[PDB]
Amino acid sequence: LLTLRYLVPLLQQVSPSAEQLVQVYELTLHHTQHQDHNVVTGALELLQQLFRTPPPELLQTLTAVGGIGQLKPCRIKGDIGQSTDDDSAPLVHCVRLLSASFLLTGGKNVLVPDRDVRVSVKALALSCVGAAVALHPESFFSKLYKVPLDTTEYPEEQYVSDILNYIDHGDPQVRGATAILCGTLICSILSRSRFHVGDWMGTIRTLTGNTFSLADCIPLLRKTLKDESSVTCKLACTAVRNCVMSLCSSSYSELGLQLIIDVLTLRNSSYWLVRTELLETLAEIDFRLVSFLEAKAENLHRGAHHYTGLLKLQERVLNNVVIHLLGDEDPRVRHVAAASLIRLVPKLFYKCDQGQADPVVAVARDQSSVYLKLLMHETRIYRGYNLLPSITDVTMENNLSRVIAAVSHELITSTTRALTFGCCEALCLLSTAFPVCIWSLGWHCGVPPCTVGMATMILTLLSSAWFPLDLSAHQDALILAGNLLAASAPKSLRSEVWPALGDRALVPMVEQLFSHLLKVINICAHVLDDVAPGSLGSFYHLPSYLKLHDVLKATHANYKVTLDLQNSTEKFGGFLRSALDVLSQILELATLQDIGKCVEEILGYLKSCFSREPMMATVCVQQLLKTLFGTNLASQFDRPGLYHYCFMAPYTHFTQALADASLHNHIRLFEPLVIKALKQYTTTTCVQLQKQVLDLLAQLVQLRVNYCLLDSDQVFIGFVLKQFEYIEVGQFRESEAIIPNIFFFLVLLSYERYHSKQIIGIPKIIQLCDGIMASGRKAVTHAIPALQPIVHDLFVLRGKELETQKEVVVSMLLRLIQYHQVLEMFILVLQQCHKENEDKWKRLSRQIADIILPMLAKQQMHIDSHEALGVLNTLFEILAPSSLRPVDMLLRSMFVTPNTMASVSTVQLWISGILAILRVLISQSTEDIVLSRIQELSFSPYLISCTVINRLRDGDNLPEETFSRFLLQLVGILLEDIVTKQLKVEMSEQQHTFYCQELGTLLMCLIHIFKSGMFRRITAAATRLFRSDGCGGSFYTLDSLNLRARSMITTHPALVLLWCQILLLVNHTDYRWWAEVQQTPKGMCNRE
């Protein structure tokens, strides 16, 4: 039972069969009835695992209405049913078994004595019922027995819902497991019912007779938040974290507000785990939705005691909890408060924001920006720079400004060491999540007349007598200081010290940071070299740096005596790599006259640091080379509202995209660090080191270093060639991280001629790439990353044998054309032929269209993603128009059924292929070309009749009427697959998202076809077909599509608004729709 409990997680992802996994489950049910409570314990832990991480096969059988039957004392008094019953799903039996065995007597309001069942078994049973209820909530509403007991001993029948009476048991873990059962029951009912809670509850009340109501749980969560035990309190706020956003989104939003208010007291708790769970609870909350709910509430603002103000939940969460717990004495709580703050910045709402004047507009942006997203496609500077402008969201800049101001105020006014450290951690991580060089207005303090934020405040701490000695806060401050100075470059660069910088007020800050970095790197070099202190990095004469040396010496001495080689958190290595990372960043602003008298000192320091941080040291060596050869940044530098977001901006963007369619001797100082990097590569397993050494060599070859004199006898190329023998055979671990860098290095080595012989040659590189294909390892992981360097060379920037190598490379790409990353390479090939040879572009475009269109028809393209569908849509614009011109290939590749509709992946592949054809038709051909060829090709609307769809779910007239029925049937398929499908059980989160994006794209096509004025015959056919019966029930009626679309109001309001727009474009103005969506007189944000 323990071995099975470890195995279960690995088989959620010859293969484990349904019958095997049902036998694991039935063994588990059997062994809960054992005489030994050790065996019962192992069986309930296995059942808990089996529900927390269900095997894909088993999950279907446990939730299906007969899914298993279709394929000391035992305390069970009566008929609970069986695992093999045909009348209900197995989880209904399972919940009854657990209840009758461990929790319930059959008599109302009697708890099973702790004499009979131990508290650890009660806690495991309550946990298992919650994990079953999460998958199948109807289980909770059951009568305990299918057949009543002896009736003289039991005068009223008992429901399974009596397990909630364990909320006031003596054991903290039993009370808390009951709180988590309340939490998971609320979330499951609201999600399973699609927020149609009264209809789902009135149905289960009719099926089981049970009068229990979801509002009865909220008093139990409120009660257990106030528990005397910190264990129960942790479990109660975990129960709130699981259900609070679902409550806020439901008809019970007022109870959602009440739970948010009642958790705010947990910030005062002595138990640190209650504080971190509160922070993680508050980090989930959409404060846009809370701002809508607060604006609606009349009397939640009064509380228990008639308060006279306006509740102000966001201000209290941001200041009184999240920023307040940056001052927490426990560094674990500060870390979680800093992480929670970053998650909150997107979710905050403030009045007078020009992007969103009202919180209903703020929520409508969030709903629309996922599903109404358009199908789109189309000397490196270091981590923190951004030369080009960006389209930043003003609302996000405003939120970020308001957050950075609050955290900077606490940092300036800080009386205590803990709050100073927590505000530097919060600012440092914000500078990573919202980079200063992108979000420069969010970070602006008014200082430059693009920004520098609070840099002098951060540098004042680095100049303090105490702050540098906390290595974690010192790392964060160095990283933050570099990020603030780097973000000045789009404004402060010049087209005698720091001559590139232009804005002379920053030179004091940059010199202060560079000098400091060289001192701390010198301390690390001395600590690693085991040498004692006693020239810009010199520090022996400075009292603060001697204290830093003692802290770093003590930290490294503690490391020398351990063997935790997997540990990420080593404070000396973390400190050293943070100082090297920030030095690497500052060197982009430097020039040879800034560095030329201390490059020898830094290379001496890097040689000491190399054996500790070899990867980040190699990044510094590369940045120093960019400063010497002059290839760094310093040297190369020669109103809206609801109509807008829900429809008009999406539609104008779609209709524009449809119209653009078819229209010096110091180099010898580097030898020992280059040679250590070569020797390291040949003695290590770290693929991130090995990547960096190949990047270094590629740079040395671009900087015209003689590779033939560096690599005597080709020993290093020989070694690199031998790695392919282990990469092909599956033996070289993490090789997905090294292949693109090897292929880039070998294509550079093809051009060089330092010897009269060629070093590698493109024939070998094509053969090595074909070896990765032929050896049978995954293409997207291995073969595609090998092709990308080769294609970019040969087609952009590479004797007539070269044209045959280009044709061989096209012969590689055709073997992989199902993958969208290979369609990206065909976009690069086609554009490079178009500029050079019209006739070769036309032949390639025909060669591609003759392969692609048969594969769309058979669902063989890997286009089950918005990214892949976007890449396919741009490829069809980049193909020569002649290759798509007789539309009969397109129309024969559309107007197909899939091999089945029983699986989500097959329906998604099919509809994705249809949407790719449909866009090419409505953009690159006129209505008359399409409708005339349809009538000659003899398609029919009965292709996807309801009778055909139903058999494909189980397993395997005019042209204007034909085209309109096909699109109108696809709408009915998508609406059924969005409303009538269960998350995790039947589709994943990414599948549910891509269904909604396919439907949003399909409805945008119908809006363009009906509104543009170009497709008049199709608009008349649609206006007739929406205004008929389903031809004797063979097609979807408009009533049936509307019944589905009404059901989406509570969950996909953006898709429902596109459906309303289509109803207007076909003149469907019946008040039986419009009075219900508009709510005419004869709460939920998504309804508003």
Binding site: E19, V22, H30, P73, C74
Partner: peptide
């Protein structure tokens, strides 16, 4: 009590 399973069969538990 009595239980039938799909993958075992007609097992009995003392009571």
């Amino acid at each position: 009590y009595t239980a039938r399973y799909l993958t075992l069969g007609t097992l009995h538990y003392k009571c």
